[PDB]
Write a protein that binds this ligand. Structure first.
Ligand SMILES: *[C@@H]1O[C@H](CO)[C@@H](O)[C@H](O)[C@H]1NC(C)=O
Lengths: 43, 48, 42
């Protein structure tokens, strides 16, 4: 069910928050300020 | 660096701060640019 | 200033026993973290 974890001090793009998403063949890790809403993506 | 940035009446893009609410933890990003309230008065804009 | 991630896979409330979490990756960034989130799928 769980396919990643996103950490950071702010949900907006104000600071470089950390992003780890899990996939079927690899793990992409980038700490580079994505925008985040109140609702996470549910795939 | 006296040969590049030294210019009278200009280059006001580098901005330093001195006081905020709490002592923030080391190696933390500085983003917020809201004003500190004086505590005794409800500071909202230009205050005393 | 170092992001340490320890993980351990065990085939199975938390179940009883003991399993030492082995370090998986060590990411060398020193980014500041104050809160943290979790994500699910449907
Ligand atoms: C991207 O820009 C934002 C604001 O412009 C900044 O806070 C952030 O640190 C930048 N991301 C970097 C330098 O990776």
């Amino acid at each position: 069910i769980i396919r990643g974890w996103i950490f950071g001090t702010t949900l907006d793009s104000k600071t470089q928050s950390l992003l780890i998403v899990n996939n079927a063949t690899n793990v992409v890790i980038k700490v580079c300020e994505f925008q985040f809403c109140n609702d996470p993506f549910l795939d | 660096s006296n040969k590049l940035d030294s210019k009278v009446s200009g280059n006001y893009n580098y901005l330093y701060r001195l006081f905020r609410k709490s002592n923030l933890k080391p190696f933390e990003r500085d983003i917020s640019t809201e004003i500190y309230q004086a505590g005794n008065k409800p500071c909202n804009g230009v205050a005393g | 200033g170092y992001f340490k991630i320890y993980s351990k896979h065990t085939p199975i409330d938390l179940p009883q026993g003991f399993s030492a979490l082995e370090p998986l990756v060590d990411l060398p960034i020193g980014i500041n973290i104050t809160r943290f989130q979790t994500l699910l799928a449907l």
